Amino acid sequence: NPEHYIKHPLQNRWALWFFKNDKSKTWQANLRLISKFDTVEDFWALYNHIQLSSNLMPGCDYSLFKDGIEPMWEDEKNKRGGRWLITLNKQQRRSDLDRFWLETLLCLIGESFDDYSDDVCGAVVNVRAKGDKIAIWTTECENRDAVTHIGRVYKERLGLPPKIVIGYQSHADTAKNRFVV
Numbered sequence: 001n002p003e004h005y006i007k008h009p010l011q012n013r014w015a016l017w018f019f020k021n022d023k024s025k026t027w028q029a030n031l032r033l034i035s036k037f038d039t040v041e042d043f044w045a046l047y048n049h050i051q052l053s054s055n056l057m058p059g060c061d062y063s064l065f066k067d068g069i070e071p072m073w074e075d076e077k078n079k080r081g082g083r084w085l086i087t088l089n090k091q092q093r094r095s096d097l098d099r100f101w102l103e104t105l106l107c108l109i110g111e112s113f114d115d116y117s118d119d120v121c122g123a124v125v126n127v128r129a130k131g132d133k134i135a136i137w138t139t140e141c142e143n144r145d146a147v148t149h150i151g152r153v154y155k156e157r158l159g160l161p162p163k164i165v166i167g168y169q170s171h172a173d174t175a176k177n178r179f180v181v
């Protein structure tokens, strides 16, 4: 009976990355691979072992990306892409940051965007004194149907009311909203 002893494989293998701001080093040198996983059980083992985003020192990031995609604009799968951005105020560090981030992780590993989950590259949480950010990165900023489907599903999974609007920005511009939902 395979069900009783095999781990549950995920559709993709994922890599978790950590960034710590250190002014001595370049941005790329501050980015480090923590580990990879490709089962539900190994996901939770990693998540349960690491700090909540709300407990990270200001200036740190977590990134969860499909194995083979580095969490940087320069990666072949990100250079023509962009991000759905969730901007948090300082009070939301306490109320929403960790629950939004875990919901974002599950959207990725559970492949929650139907046919368009293949357009997903990964997600990033930035812990910053001026206000935290969470973002889902996708591979092609010109694929309007894929980008807007991901954005609408993401907004509903986060539980954001219609009085909130979230925006999608291309990395080429970051390096202006193209879409809003």
Ligand SMILES: CO[C@@H]1[C@H](O)[C@@H](COP(=O)(O)O[P@](=O)([SeH])OP(=O)(O)O)O[C@H]1n1c[n+](C)c2c(=O)[nH]c(N)nc21
Residues within 6 Å of the ligand: 027, 071, 072, 073, 074, 126, 128, 133
């Ligand atoms: C070279 O500087 C860039 C960014 O200007 C710098 C800060 O990115 P970042 O840490 O995303 O900005 P925040 O601290 Se949330 O603050 P604002 O976005 O300015 O409100 O971090 C570097 N950086 C940030 N990212 C995401 C990248 C990247 O993908 N590739 C490269 N080459 N650099 C990146």
